[PDB]
Design a protein around this nucleic acid. Structure first.
Lengths: 128, 60, 147, 84, 207, 102
RNA sequence: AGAACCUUACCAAAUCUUGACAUCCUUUGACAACUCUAGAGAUAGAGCCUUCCCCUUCGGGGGACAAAGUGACAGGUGGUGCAUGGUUGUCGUCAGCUCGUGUCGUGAGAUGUUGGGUUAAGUCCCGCAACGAGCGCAACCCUUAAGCUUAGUUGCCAUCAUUAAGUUGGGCACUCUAAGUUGACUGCCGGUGACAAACCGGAGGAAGGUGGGGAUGACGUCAAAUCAUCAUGCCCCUUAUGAUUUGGGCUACACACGUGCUACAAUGGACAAUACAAAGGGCAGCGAAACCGCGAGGUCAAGCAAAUCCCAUAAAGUUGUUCUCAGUUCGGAUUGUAGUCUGCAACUCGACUACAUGAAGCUGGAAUCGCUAGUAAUCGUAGAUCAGCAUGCUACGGUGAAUACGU
């Protein structure tokens, strides 16, 4: 067969996408998506790239991912999805870029500076 | 006074640790690093002279 | 200054829930709020048999203020029509505030009671709407020839 | 808090051994910080140097929960005007 | 309020005045260098050196003092530097190859000028004329602008003050400057007199 | 993995000096041999030292330092007393931290 | 950015006098350690030996020793930060502040820097007896947001074979790692706008109007702080305002305030199972497995100068059971007991575990603080300092929204 591979980066995490057309089924790290996301019922947001792009679908997916919390990496899949769907055909880019899902976010945490401490709280003043 | 404590931290001691690590030039014992054995202000100031390998730029 | 909405929360398929859950998540724990909101929305369907959509929509309809006041300057206060975004924000805000003030021991039953009693055009959220609509649109005399 | 063992000042030992084999004394000069009371320390009048003047304290049998470490505090009224 | 540009330009537009193998044991070699940095005053006092560079290989020491008067330090025909090595290894306890090095545009440097101005301030010379003639000579030598500040009780007088006569451009908040900052101190009968000379002599990289 | 090899590790505090030294050593190594391994980078450990811009009070105005440390790895296969000299002969400039091994 | 001692300046006592210590002369000497005694130690009282080592032709020269004489002296955390150098805060990253040539005005001054438009910005355009320049905002630098080339070990396993395992054969496609560049600069278009500045929208792109952040803090103000880092003028002390040691003390206790931590619980309590980080540190340091112990910890010894091994299970979180509104299996304060580690000694004053008690406290008044998106709220982690001791600091990651109508 044929396989399309594009990376996904978000929130100090890394995604190695393996996209192969099919009936549609994902097993992240040889483990199903429901077996990897707490709780969670937000995988339909991960299916939005399949709902607006390649309507309705679907393609089988295998992925290996490590680093960062579950939200940042469960959201890193979509940019690899978009890259692979653009690699498949440039037609899908017009529907992708009007909604995003390809532009990898450039926003992460910030350093820390005097005023913050063990918890991310600013200091007070001397009243009275 | 500081002058006799240069000898105090130099002479032998009754047992293992009645010592404290102070800077060789600056007499201030507080806020010193074992990697260099220089105090707070002296090592900051020598960093600006560009003598000790490494940097002061920060912003990291 | 814009809003930066949140789009999908197909649990259950709806949009107001998506904005609602983001208020109950005290100290940034979204799963607990999602679970309890789901349990409460299944409960409100269980007792007094109906669909969650009808009860929720008509409940937030009975508790959404349409006129509201704002102060400025002696002491005067201009009644002002509320934007739909701020309308729903205030509705959900006061709904959750009075669900907290209800004070029940259950994960879900307090919210079910709140929304289903609002479905009867009664309740503390309805009380807040009535109080605001009584103080407002009764003193619209002075600041009506203004913004 | 030592399970390694007791830690009686050897110096106090050397003096008290001769002090105890023959007739004891009712006054003793020492520093008594690196030691403690043990069964063989009974019947003496040691003096922990509180810092200003060492005060002789007579050894009793019943001080097992208490020890030689300290009996005459340096705070010494109080430091405060009021009381406990 | 302000900081020293040599502390900000470093790592980018200039290497460090000392170099050695970067083993994690820093105290031994750093305080060996400290002894050199102390003892070099005994050559600064008469030669008015600029700054010493110290490379340090495995088994050797190779240093270089930036001075404008080698004669004083090199001896007639080498009569001094070998004796410098003899009195150096007595505390270094390691071999060394001292290599005197000359600076180009000898009297344009900062530390030489600062030391000079402190010097004629030692023997009760007026502050205005010294700095004016210094800055005029520096502008003769070719540069885009220099600054000179003096501090303390000027003219041996009442409570301290601070003055400056700056000319030309002296970019400070920029980052490609490679400006030679320096500093000096001066005592005649009262307190101490410090100076803060500044120069700016073109944009250039070490690479 | 078993094989004939020579492995070296490089340390310096300037990326330009360390990579130029690595380049010249690779040149000499493949000059008197072949199949040399390139200047493989390494996560280049850093340092940090928090210090207060102050003399007597005001810890609020803190300021930071670091000591960046480049590390480099080169491997050589099929040794010879020629690559031995190519390693132990030329390391200049002497800010770099070389340790010859096998 | 580590007060048992030490640190510590102060207190009590015992002690010292070229002194604890630094240079100099004479005088010598290579330099000492372990024991006996006194002593809380300091110190000594003795054994004993530290023993001309580099250069010697009998001397010597010499790094280094030596005790005494010993005069310069040393020494002072002794005063003055209102004499100072230097250094550091604040106004405040506020956008301003000035100088040269000319002109006007008897002059002080103005003039530019004024006026319109415009900007986060004295940023820019136009006009104007002002024209130029400097310091400053900008950027110049570091980091982060994307791609490409270079190079593949300790990193990775996509094609495979195998394995507890990327552990090994291989692989460098991918990720990653660090060097260099590419990229975002009103850059292009349309409209507005004195055609200009500039503004608005759109495309493109990973990233459009200094992208996000950091470093940087103008002339100067607060006679701001520091003579206790240091240096230093002037003044003061010296058989003591200096010096050594032991113990005490910086930690007291009717209370006031600040800062923060933990609770006053059903988004919760306890137990069980279970997935997901980054950064940093480690040589005589990291302590793997195993065994022992309820436990703090103990034996053990592999590996480890570091992409290799360790710290190090990440935690919150998810699946379950139970608890069912009480001062509650809430809270975990106080006390006693039994133990663990460091240090010689945890008694005034170390930390930790188990058992025993289970306090106030059921969201807080007047008043008040912080915060415009990865922020707050919230959860953990590591480091520094460190014989042992951090609710503090620095740093790292996890999770993570509400609203900003408008001046």
């Amino acid at each position: 067969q044929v396989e399309y591979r594009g990376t996904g980066r978000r929130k100090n995490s890394v995604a190695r996408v393996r996209l192969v057309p099919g009936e549609g089924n994902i097993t992240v790290n040889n483990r199903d998506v429901r077996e990897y996301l707490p709780f969670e019922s937000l995988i339909l947001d991960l299916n939005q790239p399949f709902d607006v792009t390649e309507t309705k679908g679907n393609y089988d997916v295998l992925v290996n991912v490590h680093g960062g919390g579950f939200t940042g990496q469960a959201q890193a899949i979509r940019h690899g999805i978009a890259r692979a769907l653009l690699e498949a055909d440039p037609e899908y880019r017009g529907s992708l870029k009007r909604a995003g899902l390809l532009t990898r976010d450039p926003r992460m945490k910030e350093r820390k500076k005097p005023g913050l401490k063990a918890a991310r709280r600013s200091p007070q003043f001397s009243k009275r | 006074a500081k002058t006799s404590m240069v000898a105090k931290q130099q002479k032998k001691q009754k047992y293992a640790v009645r010592e404290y690590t102070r800077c060789e030039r600056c007499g201030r014992p507080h806020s010193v690093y074992r990697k260099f054995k220089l105090c707070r202000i002296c090592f900051r100031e020598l960093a600006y002279k560009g003598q000790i390998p490494g940097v002061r730029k920060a912003s990291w | 200054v814009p809003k930066r909405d949140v789009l999908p929360d197909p649990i259950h398929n709806s949009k107001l829930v998506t904005k609602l859950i983001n208020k109950i998540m005290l100290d940034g724990k979204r799963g607990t709020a999602q679970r309890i909101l789901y349990s409460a929305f299944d409960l409100v369907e269980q007792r007094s048999g109906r669909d969650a959509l009808e009860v929720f929509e008509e409940a937030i309809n009975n508790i959404m203020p349409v006129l509201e006041v704002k102060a400025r300057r002696s002491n005067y206060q201009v009644p002002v029509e509320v934007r739909p975004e701020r309308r729903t924000t205030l509705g959900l805000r006061w709904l959750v505030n009075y669900a907290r003030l209800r004070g029940e021991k259950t994960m879900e039953d307090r919210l079910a009671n709140e929304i289903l009693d609002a479905a009867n055009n009664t309740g503390g959220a309805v009380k807040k709407r009535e109080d605001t609509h009584k103080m407002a649109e009764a003193n619209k005399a002075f600041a009506h020839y203004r913004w | 808090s030592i399970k390694k063992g007791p830690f009686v000042d050897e110096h106090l030992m050397k003096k008290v051994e001769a002090q105890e084999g023959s007739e004891k004394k009712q006054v003793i000069k020492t520093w008594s910080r690196r030691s403690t009371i043990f069964p063989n320390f009974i019947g003496h009048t040691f003096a922990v140097y509180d810092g200003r003047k060492h005060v002789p304290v007579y050894v009793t049998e019943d001080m097992v929960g208490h020890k030689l470490g300290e009996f005459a505090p340096t705070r010494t009224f109080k430091g405060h005007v009021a009381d406990d | 309020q302000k900081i020293n540009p040599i502390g900000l330009r470093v790592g980018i537009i200039r290497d460090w005045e000392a170099k050695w193998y970067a083993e994690k044991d820093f105290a031994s070699l750093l305080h060996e260098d400290l002894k050199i940095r102390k003892f070099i005053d005994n050559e600064l006092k008469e030669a008015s050196v600029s700054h010493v560079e110290i490379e340090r290989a495995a088994n050797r020491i190779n240093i270089a003092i930036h001075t404008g008067k080698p004669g004083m330090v090199i001896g007639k025909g080498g009569s001094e530097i070998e004796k410098l090595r003899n009195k150096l290894n007595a505390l270094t306890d390691k071999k060394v190859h001292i290599n005197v090095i000359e600076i180009k545009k000898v009297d344009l440097d900062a530390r030489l000028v600062a030391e000079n101005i402190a010097r004629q301030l030692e023997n009760r010379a007026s502050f205005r004329r010294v700095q004016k003639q210094a800055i005029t000579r520096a502008m003769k030598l070719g540069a885009k602008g220099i600054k000179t500040q003096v501090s303390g009780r000027l003219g041996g007088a009442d409570i301290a003050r601070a003055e400056q006569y700056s000319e030309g451009t002296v970019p400070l908040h920029t980052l490609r400057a490679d400006i030679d900052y320096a500093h000096a101190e001066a005592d005649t009968t009262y307190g101490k007199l410090g100076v803060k000379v500044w120069i700016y002599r073109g944009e250039v990289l070490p690479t | 993995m078993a094989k004939q090899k020579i492995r070296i590790r490089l340390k310096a505090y300037d990326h330009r000096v360390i990579d130029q030294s690595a380049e010249k050593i690779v040149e000499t190594a493949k000059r008197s041999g072949a199949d040399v391994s390139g200047p493989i980078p390494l996560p280049t450990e850093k340092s940090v030292y928090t210090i207060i811009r102050a003399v007597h009070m005001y810890k609020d105005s803190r300021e930071q330092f670091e000591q960046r440390t480049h590390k480099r790895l080169i491997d050589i296969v099929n040794p010879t007393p020629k690559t031995v000299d190519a390693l132990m002969g030329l390391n200049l400039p002497s800010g770099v931290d070389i340790e010859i091994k096998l």
